[PDB]
Symmetry: C3
Subunit: 455 residues, 3 copies
């Protein structure tokens, strides 16, 4: 006998309601198998992968990850794939959990402006990745063509207060991390498995700040977690909390009470969290340069009463979360746009630099530029800064060590280099500093920084 | 008490029958512990890692992976390692599952033309990797020195219809992927964990096309899956199906009903599959550039009746499987040989290009070169192609965008670059196209392409 | 109800006794929850990451990994973090297993010369990584800022004969592997996840030779195994043995009878081993270039009677363990120091070369330089060596093939290149050989080798 042997579809055909990340459709809440009609449209379009950094994404339903599909084990699914007329490429779909060659791929080839359909029975309960399967497949996946399909057990999943949808992917731009402009896909970096960005839900900051996930003390949260890849394996982890349960795909095994899991490329898991104390809980790939240098962090923000018996301490800040502590970094987007338009003002630079200074500089120099006397020199009203702005560009790019005198006090420490900052970032940060804290004003341009970097 | 405490060996000494991949020895079918004599011979030899690409493999038993060994928990194994006189290197063996230092390594050092032996008790049921343990060990492993040993539980494994043997490895050539000739091992790429090929069973296409694994609807298939490494972890996955069971090494835990697993470097697992519907099921490393750009795909082809209640769709084709949809790519081997011999004909190039066109070009241009009107321009009877063959070389290497006119119709789309194709591949593909579909004939040489690439 | 609900702290406040790797504090042996005061001091200091290779480590408690902390589920922990006045950087802590934002990070920011404190309840039994959480976090972790905290179940762990503490990390030096001197951290290699060293307990040889872990036949050994990362996932494996049990973090799942596991970056596990037969058992990352080319090997040496019914063979030697078979390689440290001081003698070079020859050359040429007649040519009393020392430098760096005559006999084989050896290593090895086995003496300098490498 096949699994999912619940008899022929009954009732009326159901038109599936799909959701955009990070939301999930309601529980199916049904005791009979149905014919479920799923309609999903591929759209190719430019979106911001980071502030001021555009990328041509290929999407299922206009989002990365693609629209979430929710059905019941034993359902017959009539799957309709449309390819928007604006597309340049053909596309198709492989749904994990489908019983049949290619997971649908050979019956879903869809040229721009066309539609395809195929039917399958959902024999297999579980959470499953779906993705494009059009050669070169890795390119399609790298461009954002992946999402999740949930096939519920017949009795449904246990009730929880919130359900969310989070999916990791690795991305490959020609430019370096945070280099502005429209960035092409880079096949060389992709083949080498050397991503420039590693993200949740298709962009830096997609689930941070004002886009965080929410719940309250005492509530339960289920997260459907995918890893679209194409290539990386996630050391998936929640900072400051624990997973009550982790279940992969439709596996019989359920791990309980773990904080760090491994999610294969192409894999998916359901995790459960119980909110205990208020604050920001960070979902990361704990291959930690991905999380804190390439974009792979997402926030579940918990509202409610502190419990000093459990945790006496404070909410996170920029020391850990960096420039993603703040609600957003829209000033960076704005300054980048103004540069393109040729209208970049001092204040545009100042506000972009303010956003970028958080974490990146404030960890040592403080949010108010005061430093710490004799340990971290001040940027506020800094004689040393004012004396030589070009030296300050060199200090950001190349670091500084040795004895110096700042505002009458000696420092004898080490500031690490920061050459990974792009020329616009250095320029905007230094313009912010120059225009703060009784510093002399003026500006540093990206071209100024380019020249210092080349010397 | 030690595990495997089934008493002294009884009956007669048994000379183990080893098998070459992808086959497995018969179940031991025995109720008593035995002395089992295993004889394995190391052979160093050139073989084709891909069509027209030779590599000096170091092998246990003449194959990659090496010969499969099958014993029973509680057996006493007298292990004989011979090193063929033609060898240049010394070799030895570490069998996982052996209780003792190095898994046998210090008692199996075997110079060319010599033999070694050691005895161990198989205390540990499970599936286990064995490999060479001769410094530099990673070099030996990278050259193909790994295989599997099964230590059965005393009652035997449950009966299945088929048992197969599949083992992943990462490979490191001086040349790039599909660059022809005898390719040296590349220690720099190996240390960096940057393989040029990632393969099942020692070659591209080892388990595809006419070398696929077979079964029928309703049958059960057990696959002994190794990962020899040296360095990669497999996101091991079956496209279009599910694993009924996954069990690692001799672990007590058995996962059921998963599609994607993680197999450590040096690890092994037993998976079980039940054939439900006909077609090609693809075993892959779902770090998907490995599977679809570096060689890591294998096929289990299922014969039998369609079941439209389960899956309404079609068998896979080149869109997903690429140039491995076809039975083989022997024409590539032949053309490469003819180049070396200085006898390369137009028809040699045409047939090699035909093989390579599948997937790589046909996904957009179609198998018959017709394209799709106003979306994908034709290669069949293409005025644009005929007008400028050197432009066509540039288009393959560097891509094309912008408005063009082909056979009277305007196109305004994007063909991605394909610089990863080697000069011979570009040459042979374009010669195929030129000699098909009422195109003007002639040929493109590898040297022609080399010149365009250098400009 | 929260987990760990064992009531308010009782008894007296307990000042935790922390241990340095590879030792563990005693079992808590307590039936009531307590207030436990933990004091941990950050120290930045130069230490040898390899012989003659210095590195500026940032440490919790003066070691890498940091001091081991051991508490009981249900305890209230008052955590005190001090930052030594000699520090240049601020530091903080995130303990996995803490319930609260950042695992403590926002309440533990500690400038040089300062102290911080926070209190948390240990709700979660298990083994957990702790690490610094100061931007740039990956830099802090890469510099050595990680360790383990055990939160015992209320009844305690089962009694074992030995408990040890082992933690993997990936390291990123500007220089290549074994390049001498004080090596800076390399942010470029870190972002790319391309470590120069992969180590247990902060140094090459930290747990090999005279620093091996010990036990006796019949005894049980528990190892608390961390993976600090920052970036790599360990294919953690024991050569020649099996793990009775593997349990991750505080998971409910326990795997039994496996040899190879996967430990996520930031993850931790408890493994159990039962000693069966004498000899050296090697803990490795089985992404095997890490273990055998980058430093990731540790030894558990078992004393006691051989059991020929289980294993007839020998203890490991340099063929497998290489230059870590010997008790230590202190001669390398000494020679490097003498080079810096300008006092390097012939004998300093000889003893350093002796240490390095083991495995790296002896696998083919033998420990006594005799080779094997007509298969591996001799280095002992070698006419070919004596005839041209510069040719011998070229042979080490670039390999040798083709027919040669050595001491009257023809060889027609292949010696692989060894360009990864540094100039001092080549120099010291060849000086050893020249001063052994009736060879002519003299010396090769690092500058001699530099010149040959550049030609
Ligand atoms: C801690 C790790 C630091 C971070 C992050 C940044 N800076 Fe820094 N900076 C640091 C130190 C210890 C020193 C003194 C070095 C010494 O030789 O003793 C400095 C110095 C500067 C200066 C010059 C002195 C002054 O005006 O106070 C400048 C202009 C400066 N730092 C700027 C700066 C900016 C803009 C940063 C973010 C991009 C930044 N620093 C980060 C320590 C640390
Ligand atoms: C879809 C992703 C494509 C694949 C794969 C290949 N080609 Fe292509 N090709 C594609 C498009 C959209 C276009 C037109 C671009 C535009 O500016 O509108 C082309 C064009 C060509 C041409 C020139 C026009 C013609 O003769 O039809 C040639 C000669 C060509 N393509 C060849 C070709 C070959 C040999 C391929 C496999 C190596 C190949 N293309 C792949 C789209 C796609
Ligand atoms: C086995 C894989 C080898 C290792 C490791 C090393 N050497 Fe070697 N060496 C090897 C062979 C097969 C040959 C002969 C090559 C041929 O063309 O037939 C050699 C040769 C040399 C020589 C020259 C001949 C002689 O004097 O015997 C030298 C000086 C030499 N090898 C040195 C040497 C050193 C110092 C090594 C460690 C750094 C080393 N070899 C490793 C095989 C192998
Ligand atoms: Cu697509
Ligand atoms: Cu897939
Ligand atoms: Cu070998
Ligand atoms: Cu091994
Ligand atoms: Cu720190
Ligand atoms: Cu952490």
């Amino acid at each position: 006998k096949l699994p999912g042997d619940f008899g022929p579809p009954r009732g009326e055909p159901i038109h599936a309601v799909l959701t955009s990340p990070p939301l999930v459709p309601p529980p199916v809440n049904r005791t009979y198998p149905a014919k479920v009609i799923v309609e999903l449209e591929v759209v190719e379009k430019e979106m911001q992968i980071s502030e001021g950094v555009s990328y041509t994404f290929w999407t299922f339903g206009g989002t990365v990850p693609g629209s979430f599909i929710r059905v019941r084990q034993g359902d017959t699914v009539e799957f309709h794939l449309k390819n928007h007329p604006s597309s340049k490429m053909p596309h198709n779909i492989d749904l994990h959990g489908v019983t049949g060659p290619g997971g649908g791929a050979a019956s879903s080839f869809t040229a721009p402006g066309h539609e395809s359909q195929f039917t399958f029975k959902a024999l297999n309960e579980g959470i499953y990745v779906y993705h494009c399967a059009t050669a070169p497949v890795g390119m399609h996946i790298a461009n954002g063509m992946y999402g999740l399909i949930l096939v519920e057990p017949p009795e449904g999943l246990p009730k929880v207060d919130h359900e969310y949808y989070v999916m990791q992917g690795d991305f490959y731009t020609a430019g370096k991390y945070r280099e502005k402009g429209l960035q092409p896909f880079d096949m060389e970096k992709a083949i080498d498995e050397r991503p420039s960005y590693v993200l949740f839900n298709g962009a830096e900051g997609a689930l941070t700040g004002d886009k965080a996930l929410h719940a309250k003390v005492g509530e339960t949260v289920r997260i459907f977690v995918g890893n679209g890849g194409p290539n990386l394996v996630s050391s998936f982890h929640v900072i400051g909390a624990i997973f009550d349960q982790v279940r992969y795909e439709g596996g019989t095994n359920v791990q309980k009470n773990v904080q760090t899991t491994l999610i294969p490329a192409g894999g998916a898991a359901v995790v459960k969290f119980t909110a205990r104390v208020p604050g920001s809980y960070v979902l990361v790939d704990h291959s930690i340069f991905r999380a804190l240098n390439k974009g792979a962090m997402a926030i579940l923000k918990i509202d409610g009463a502190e419990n000093k018996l459990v945790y006496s301490g404070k909410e996170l800040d920029s020391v850990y979360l960096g420039d993603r502590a703040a609600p957003n970094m829209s000033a960076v987007t704005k300054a980048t746009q103004a540069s393109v338009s040729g209208t970049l003002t001092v204040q545009d630079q100042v506000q972009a630099g303010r956003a970028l200074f958080a974490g990146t500089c404030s960890v040592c120099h403080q949010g108010n530029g005061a430093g710490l006397p004799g340990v971290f020199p001040p940027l506020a009203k800094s004689d040393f800064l004012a004396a030589d702005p070009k030296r300050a560009m060199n200090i950001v790019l190349h670091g500084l060590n040795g004895k110096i005198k700042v505002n009458g006090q000696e420092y004898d420490s080490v500031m690490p280099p920061m050459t990974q900052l792009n020329d616009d970032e250095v320029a905007n940060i230094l313009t912010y500093v120059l225009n703060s804290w009784d510093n002399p004003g003026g500006r540093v341009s990206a071209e100024d920084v380019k020249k210092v970097r080349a010397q």
